[PDB]
Design a protein around this ligand. Structure first.
Ligand SMILES: Cc1cc2nc3c(=O)[nH]c(=O)nc-3n(C[C@H](O)[C@H](O)[C@H](O)COP(=O)(O)O)c2cc1C
Length: 365
């Protein structure tokens, strides 16, 4: 139990030197959807030997974005420019996975080919009063009414996850992650709060997992289990992605992932679960035990909980978001209990390749 965020870890193929993971974070510095030297510097900065990083959500197809200047990886151009980023990470000995991200209904005509309707599991839009999509000009507008996918039209989207995945590896990524929550596409099929379907993709918790299963099994076949993570924060009501029973929803996801590992054999790279974030951390254990494999914690963490997450064996490898945004050398700072730069929301999603991106300074040598 004396293990900590600094205890080495074997994540299948990858030997991590610590449990500090760079959580996947969209930063919108990938102008026009293609990676560049800014993302290269950004990731290389936060890289450490045996350190695991997850890329900002990356488009798996045209129309799969819901934010400005997010990187894509479904094409050759995107792939080519991703290489520099990945190389900048590998040169520094880190591991990097490309998150598989499709925003589904959480998009806008502005991000859709031909200014069309983003797709989803449902036709219901993300309620306006609570959230709005952020357009490239910086304004915030209402999420539009999404067109529910046709049952048959689903295996296609899967192809996009497969190509993008195969591309990820082509660009050198050590693997990919499955962004299955936060109200995005896959989640819109998982959450009963969103999934108002009645066909072969909805209703029963099992069917609600069908899309995720097809994507995971689809990408796995394409690149191999241990090269795939599948983030699922079923207790996060982001973008109206609520669920009547999060704990039981996650167990179904876990079950499906355990079933996959039994047949497919090899274990997935990991299961990533954002805290549902008195009572603000008693529900991760269940999945953190129901699952046969490495469990990544995310959401609200700091060194304090990270250590307890590992130490008190609450959870394996832990990903960090905002703190990593503000601390390129988060691992070091954490490892020595040093100062932590403060993060600034204003530049979370701006396009400056520098300001709010590569500015947070490393500790004074
Ligand atoms: C600017 C920003 C971008 C994010 N982008 C993504 C993303 O692209 N994919 C994803 O799955 N989660 C994303 N998240 C979820 C966050 O990773 C998670 O809420 C965050 O890491 C928690 O940071 P905090 O608890 O560690 O300090 C993002 C969060 C922020 C703040």
């Amino acid at each position: 139990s004396n293990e900590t965020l600094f205890s080495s870890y074997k994540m299948g193929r990858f030997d991590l030197s610590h449990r500090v993971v760079l959580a996947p974070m969209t930063r919108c510095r990938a102008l026009n959807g293609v990676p560049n030297a800014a993302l290269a510097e950004y990731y290389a900065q936060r890289t450490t030997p045996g350190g695991f990083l997850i890329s900002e959500g990356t488009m798996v197809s045209p129309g799969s974005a819901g934010f400005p200047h997010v990187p894509g990886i479904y094409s050759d151009e995107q792939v080519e420019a991703w290489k520099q980023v990945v190389e900048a990470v590998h040169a520094k000995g880190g591991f990097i996975f490309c998150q598989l991200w499709h925003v589904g209904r959480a998009s806008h005509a502005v991000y859709q080919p031909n200014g069309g309707s983003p797709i989803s599991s449902t036709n219901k839009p993300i309620s306006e009063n609570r959230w709005r999509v952020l357009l490239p000009d910086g304004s915030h507008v209402k999420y539009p009414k999404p067109r529910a996918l046709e049952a048959s039209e689903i295996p296609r989207v899967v192809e996009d996850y497969c190509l993008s995945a195969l591309n990820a590896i082509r660009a050198g990524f050590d693997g990919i992650e499955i962004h299955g929550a936060h109200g995005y596409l896959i989640d819109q099929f998982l959450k009963d709060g969103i999934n108002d379907r009645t066909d072969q993709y909805g209703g029963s918790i099992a069917n609600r997992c069908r899309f995720l299963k097809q994507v995971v099994e689809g990408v796995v076949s394409a690149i191999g289990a241990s090269k795939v993570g599948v983030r699922v924060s079923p207790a996060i009501d982001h973008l109206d992605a609520t669920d009547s029973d999060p704990l039981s929803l996650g167990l179904a996801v876990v079950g499906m992932l355990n079933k996959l590992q039994g047949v497919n054999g090899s274990k997935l790279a990991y299961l990533h679960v954002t805290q549902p974030r008195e009572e603000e951390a008693k529900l991760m254990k269940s999945l953190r035990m129901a699952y046969n494999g490495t469990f990544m914690s995310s959401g609200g963490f700091n060194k304090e909980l990270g250590m307890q997450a590992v130490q008190q064996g609450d959870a394996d490898l832990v990903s960090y978001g905002r703190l990593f945004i503000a601390n390129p050398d988060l691992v070091s700072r954490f490892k020595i209990d040093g100062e932590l730069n403060k993060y600034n929301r204003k530049t979370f999603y701006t396009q400056d390749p520098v300001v709010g991106y590569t500015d947070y300074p490393f500790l004074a040598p």
